[PDB]
Amino acid sequence: FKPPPRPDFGTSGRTIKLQANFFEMDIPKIDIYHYELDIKPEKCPRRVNREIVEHMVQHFKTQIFGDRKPVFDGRKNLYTAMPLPIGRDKVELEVTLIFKVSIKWVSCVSLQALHDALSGRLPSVPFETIQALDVVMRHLPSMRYTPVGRSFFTASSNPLGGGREVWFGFHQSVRPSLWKMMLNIDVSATAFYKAQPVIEFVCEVLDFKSIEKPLTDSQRVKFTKEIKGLKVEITHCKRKYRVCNVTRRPASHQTFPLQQESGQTVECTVAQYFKDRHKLVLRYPHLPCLQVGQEQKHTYLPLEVCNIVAGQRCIKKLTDNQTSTMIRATARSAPDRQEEISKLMRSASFNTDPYVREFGIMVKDEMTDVTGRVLQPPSILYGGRNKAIATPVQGVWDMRNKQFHTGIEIKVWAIACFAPQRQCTEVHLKSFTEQLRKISRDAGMPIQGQPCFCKYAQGADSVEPMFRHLKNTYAGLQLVVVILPGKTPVYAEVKRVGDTVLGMATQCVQMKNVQRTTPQTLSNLCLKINVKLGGVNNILLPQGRPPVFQQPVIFLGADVTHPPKKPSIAAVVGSMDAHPNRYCATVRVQQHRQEIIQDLAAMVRELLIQFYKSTRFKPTRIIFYRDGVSEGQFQQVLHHELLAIREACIKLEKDYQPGITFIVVQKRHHTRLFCTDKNERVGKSGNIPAGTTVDTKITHPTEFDFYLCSHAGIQGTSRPSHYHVLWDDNRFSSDELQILTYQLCHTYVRCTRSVSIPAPAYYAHLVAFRARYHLVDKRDHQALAKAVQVHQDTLRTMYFA
RNA sequence: UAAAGUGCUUCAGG
C-alpha cells in the first residue's frame, strides 16, 4: 500500500527552459516546538480563535510568551521558534472586546529530519513538519486577509449578477521537492456573495429593478434556494444567523408562540412583535421572513432587517452567464499571469515577515528554473483510399484530405426538429442536410441519402412516442438527429429514451447550428456521429506505440462527480481494442460526496468481461487512470480501489493476476509553467507547447510523479496535468509511462486535438455527466441505480461521445 | 445541444 519509488528520470523529448511558480525556501536545521491549545468554548470560528490567541500573546508577555512571536493554525496548534517556559499544562483566561485557554507541550518538530527526508534517505516525509512550516508561512496573511481553503482573498466591483461577484486573491502552500522545500504561489479568483441588504439580494436574484405585492410560490422557491444556508446579520439592534429556510407566510401573518407575563402563551405575528418590541413598523410586511437558528424556537426575521454577511464564498452552481463572465474576467495569458505572481511575491515580502524571520526562514524571490522536455507527438493513422497519416502540430491536426479509419456508411437516419418551424424552416433543414452529407462524404462517413423521416415536435412529452414510432417503423434505423431551441428539458428525455429505453443512437444539434452551417462544425459533428454508430475515427500509428502494447492491455478511466441530498456518480470506462480507440462505460449512483468508488470491483469485472468478449484476450496489464483525487486521499483511495481491482480479477479467475498500474490524474492544482525563451511561447496566450513534460526539480522527492501539459493553451494560462503513480506492478520507466500518457491524450475522438487528460479519464467524466441527464425526472435508491442503467445494444458503443 | 481550452467547483433572542 506504499507508492513505488521513482524508477528513473525521463530522457525523451526536446529540452525546454521553463520557470515554475515554485520558490525555493531556505529552512534552518533548528528544532521547532509544538504546543496544543484547548479553547473554551470550542467550535468557535478559526477567525475568533486567532483573535483570542492574538490577545493571549499580547497579554501574557510578562509571564509566558516574552519577545518571541508564536504562530497558530486557527484551531489547536501553536508553534514557537524557541521553547516556552512551560513544562506542563497551564490554564488561562482571555477577555475579548471571556475565554478559557490552556496550553500544553506536544513535541519538537525536527527540521533536520525534513532536510534528510528531502535528500531521499527517509522512506516518508514527516507530514507533521511540513504542516508546521505551512502554519508559519500563512500566519501573517491569515490575520490580514480572508482565508478560503489554502487561498486568501480581500475586497478590491466585479459583479456576476444574481447577488454574486468574483474576488481576486492568491493561493499559497508549502511543498516538498528533491533537496529543498518549495513555496507554491499563484493567483486565484472565486465567486462570493455581495455584502448587501437582503432586500437588495432578492431583487438581484428575482430580477427586480426596485423592490417596489407578495411573492408567488415560484419566486419564493427560487429565493429560498438562493439564500438557504447563507449567513445574515441583523441591523435593528449585529449578531449573525444562518438561514434555515424562508417562511411561506408574510411577516404580517407569520406567527410565533410568545409566553406572556403569566405562563400563558399566545401566537404573535412577526410584524406585530417588531412593532411592539422594537418600535419598528415593517416597510415590507407583505414579504416573507427568514427562519434561523432552530425550527423549534421559531425565530423569524423580516428581510429588511437583514444583510448578507460579507465574506461568504459561493458554492452553489453558477448560471451559464455568470460562469461566462467569470471566465472572461479571470482569463490571463501566461506572460501576464507570471507577472501577476511576481507582484504577489513582492507584496508578500516573505523575507520581511516577522513571523517568517522569527523562524529563521527565507524565501527566494525568483521562480524556480526547471528544464522540461517536449515529447514528440504520435502520428495519427486515418483510413480510406489515402490511409493518410496526420502529424499533430502544436497539439492540433485536421482531417483535410483524410477519411475515418473505419468509417460507417449511413443508409437510414431520421431528423426530429424540436425547434419551432418559424425559425427553423424546411429551407434550413434541407440546407443543413445537404451540407452535412457533403461533409460526411469528405470525412469518409458517407450519408448515402436523404433522411427517411422529418417532423417537427415540442413539449418534451413527444420524445418517447416519436421514438417508439421510428424504431418500429424504419428497419435498420441508425441515427436520429435531434434539433433543439437552446437549453431545454427535452435534451434530457432524448438521452433518457435513446440511451436508457429504446437504445437508439441520437445526435442533438442546436437550432442556430442548422440555420448557418460551417464545415468545421459539421465536420466536428461527424466525429461524434461516426463514433456513436460504431466507427473508428482514427488510431495511433500502430508502430511507435510504447512496448506495453506488446501484450493485451486494458486502459481504464475513472472519475466521480459530485452534485451541487442527491447522490454522487461514479463512472469507469475501459478500452475494448488494441488501438486503443473504443471504450465501454460502467456507471453507478452512490453516497453523496463519497470520493471512493464503492462498487468498483463489479464495474471492473463488467469491463474485463466486455474486453474478453471483444478481443478474445484476457488483459495482461491493467492501466488505471483515476481523476478527481486529492493528496489527503491517496492512501484511502489506493487502499480500497487497488484491492477492488484485484478482487475483480480474483472473482473472475482464481489465478488471474494481471499487472496493475494505478495513476492519479490531477488538473486541480496551482503548479504553473512558463517559457523562459519567448520563442517557445505558443499562440496569443503564450503558453508552453503541447507535450511539455517535467519530472524533475518541482516533483516529489522520492515517489513516481510528473507534470505533462498534453494540450495546447488556447486562452488563459495552461494547467499542466499532474500524474502520480500510486502503484505499478508493471515497472514502467519514466519515459514509457509519460509517452504512453501523452499518446492516450491523442485518442480522444470528439476533436482532432491532444486533450488535457488521457481519453479514458476524459470519457469517465462524460459518462458521469451523461448520467446526470438520465437521472432528471419528469428517489427509491433502487430506482436511482435503475434510471442510470443503459440499454443493452448501447452499452457496446460510446453513446457518451 | 459541433468542439477544445481558460476561472471556480463544502445568550429577552422570534
Short mmCIF file of N, CA and C in Angstrom, two decimals, chain A residues 557-607:
data_model
loop_
_atom_site.label_atom_id
_atom_site.label_comp_id
_atom_site.label_asym_id
_atom_site.label_seq_id
_atom_site.Cartn_x
_atom_site.Cartn_y
_atom_site.Cartn_z
N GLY A 557 -10.45 4.35 -17.23
CA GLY A 557 -10.56 5.73 -16.80
C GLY A 557 -11.67 5.81 -15.77
N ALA A 558 -11.40 6.48 -14.66
CA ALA A 558 -12.37 6.55 -13.57
C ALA A 558 -12.50 7.96 -13.01
N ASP A 559 -13.72 8.34 -12.66
CA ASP A 559 -13.99 9.66 -12.11
C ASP A 559 -15.27 9.60 -11.27
N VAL A 560 -15.38 10.51 -10.31
CA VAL A 560 -16.60 10.65 -9.53
C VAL A 560 -17.05 12.10 -9.53
N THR A 561 -18.29 12.35 -9.94
CA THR A 561 -18.82 13.70 -9.99
C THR A 561 -19.81 13.92 -8.85
N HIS A 562 -19.64 15.02 -8.13
CA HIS A 562 -20.49 15.34 -7.00
C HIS A 562 -21.48 16.45 -7.38
N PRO A 563 -22.75 16.28 -7.00
CA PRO A 563 -23.77 17.28 -7.32
C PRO A 563 -23.56 18.57 -6.53
N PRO A 564 -24.31 19.63 -6.87
CA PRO A 564 -24.12 20.94 -6.24
C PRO A 564 -24.84 21.04 -4.90
N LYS A 565 -30.58 15.08 -0.12
CA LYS A 565 -29.38 15.21 -0.93
C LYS A 565 -29.48 14.37 -2.20
N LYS A 566 -28.63 14.68 -3.17
CA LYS A 566 -28.55 13.89 -4.40
C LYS A 566 -27.22 13.16 -4.44
N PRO A 567 -27.21 11.95 -5.01
CA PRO A 567 -26.03 11.08 -4.95
C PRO A 567 -24.87 11.55 -5.82
N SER A 568 -23.68 11.09 -5.47
CA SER A 568 -22.53 11.24 -6.34
C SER A 568 -22.62 10.16 -7.40
N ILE A 569 -21.92 10.37 -8.51
CA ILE A 569 -21.94 9.43 -9.62
C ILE A 569 -20.53 8.97 -9.96
N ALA A 570 -20.31 7.66 -9.88
CA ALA A 570 -19.02 7.07 -10.22
C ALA A 570 -19.09 6.48 -11.62
N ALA A 571 -18.07 6.74 -12.42
CA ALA A 571 -18.02 6.23 -13.78
C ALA A 571 -16.66 5.61 -14.04
N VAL A 572 -16.67 4.42 -14.63
CA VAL A 572 -15.44 3.75 -15.03
C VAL A 572 -15.59 3.25 -16.45
N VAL A 573 -14.66 3.64 -17.32
CA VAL A 573 -14.66 3.19 -18.70
C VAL A 573 -13.43 2.33 -18.97
N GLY A 574 -13.54 1.42 -19.93
CA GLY A 574 -12.44 0.55 -20.29
C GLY A 574 -12.27 0.42 -21.79
N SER A 575 -11.02 0.38 -22.24
CA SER A 575 -10.74 0.21 -23.66
C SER A 575 -11.17 -1.19 -24.09
N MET A 576 -11.56 -1.33 -25.35
CA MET A 576 -12.09 -2.59 -25.86
C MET A 576 -11.37 -3.07 -27.12
N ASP A 577 -10.24 -2.44 -27.44
CA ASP A 577 -9.41 -2.90 -28.55
C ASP A 577 -7.95 -2.50 -28.33
N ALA A 578 -7.09 -2.86 -29.28
CA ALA A 578 -5.65 -2.70 -29.11
C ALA A 578 -5.12 -1.37 -29.64
N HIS A 579 -6.00 -0.56 -30.22
CA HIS A 579 -5.57 0.66 -30.90
C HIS A 579 -4.87 1.67 -29.99
N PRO A 580 -5.50 2.05 -28.86
CA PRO A 580 -6.85 1.74 -28.40
C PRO A 580 -7.82 2.87 -28.74
N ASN A 581 -9.03 2.54 -29.17
CA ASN A 581 -9.99 3.55 -29.58
C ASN A 581 -11.35 3.42 -28.90
N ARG A 582 -11.92 2.22 -28.94
CA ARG A 582 -13.28 2.02 -28.46
C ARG A 582 -13.31 1.77 -26.96
N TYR A 583 -14.29 2.35 -26.29
CA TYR A 583 -14.44 2.22 -24.84
C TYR A 583 -15.86 1.84 -24.46
N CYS A 584 -15.99 0.98 -23.45
CA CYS A 584 -17.28 0.70 -22.84
C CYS A 584 -17.37 1.39 -21.49
N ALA A 585 -18.58 1.77 -21.10
CA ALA A 585 -18.78 2.54 -19.88
C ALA A 585 -19.57 1.76 -18.83
N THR A 586 -19.16 1.91 -17.58
CA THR A 586 -19.95 1.46 -16.44
C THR A 586 -20.18 2.68 -15.56
N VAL A 587 -21.35 2.75 -14.94
CA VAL A 587 -21.69 3.90 -14.12
C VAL A 587 -22.49 3.45 -12.90
N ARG A 588 -22.33 4.18 -11.80
CA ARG A 588 -23.02 3.84 -10.56
C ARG A 588 -23.41 5.09 -9.79
N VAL A 589 -24.62 5.06 -9.23
CA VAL A 589 -25.05 6.06 -8.27
C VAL A 589 -24.52 5.63 -6.90
N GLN A 590 -24.05 6.58 -6.11
CA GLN A 590 -23.54 6.25 -4.78
C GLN A 590 -23.70 7.40 -3.78
N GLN A 591 -23.25 7.16 -2.55
CA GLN A 591 -23.40 8.11 -1.45
C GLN A 591 -22.97 9.53 -1.81
N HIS A 592 -23.77 10.50 -1.36
CA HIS A 592 -23.49 11.91 -1.59
C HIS A 592 -22.11 12.28 -1.08
N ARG A 593 -21.28 12.80 -1.98
CA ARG A 593 -19.95 13.31 -1.64
C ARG A 593 -18.94 12.23 -1.24
N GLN A 594 -19.23 10.98 -1.56
CA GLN A 594 -18.27 9.91 -1.32
C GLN A 594 -17.25 9.89 -2.45
N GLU A 595 -15.97 9.92 -2.09
CA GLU A 595 -14.89 10.03 -3.07
C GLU A 595 -14.53 8.66 -3.64
N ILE A 596 -14.53 7.65 -2.78
CA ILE A 596 -14.21 6.29 -3.20
C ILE A 596 -15.33 5.72 -4.06
N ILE A 597 -14.95 4.96 -5.08
CA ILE A 597 -15.92 4.27 -5.92
C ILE A 597 -16.32 2.97 -5.24
N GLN A 598 -17.49 2.97 -4.62
CA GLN A 598 -17.95 1.86 -3.78
C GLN A 598 -18.01 0.53 -4.53
N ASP A 599 -18.54 0.56 -5.74
CA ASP A 599 -18.82 -0.66 -6.48
C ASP A 599 -17.79 -0.93 -7.57
N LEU A 600 -16.55 -0.51 -7.34
CA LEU A 600 -15.51 -0.59 -8.36
C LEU A 600 -15.27 -2.02 -8.83
N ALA A 601 -15.18 -2.95 -7.89
CA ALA A 601 -14.91 -4.35 -8.21
C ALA A 601 -15.85 -4.86 -9.30
N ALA A 602 -17.15 -4.67 -9.09
CA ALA A 602 -18.15 -5.14 -10.04
C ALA A 602 -18.05 -4.39 -11.37
N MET A 603 -17.72 -3.11 -11.31
CA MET A 603 -17.58 -2.30 -12.52
C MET A 603 -16.40 -2.78 -13.35
N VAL A 604 -15.28 -3.04 -12.69
CA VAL A 604 -14.09 -3.52 -13.38
C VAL A 604 -14.32 -4.91 -13.96
N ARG A 605 -15.07 -5.73 -13.23
CA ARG A 605 -15.40 -7.07 -13.69
C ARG A 605 -16.18 -7.01 -15.00
N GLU A 606 -17.22 -6.18 -15.02
CA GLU A 606 -18.02 -5.99 -16.23
C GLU A 606 -17.14 -5.61 -17.42
N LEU A 607 -16.17 -4.73 -17.18
CA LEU A 607 -15.32 -4.24 -18.25
C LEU A 607 -14.35 -5.32 -18.72
#
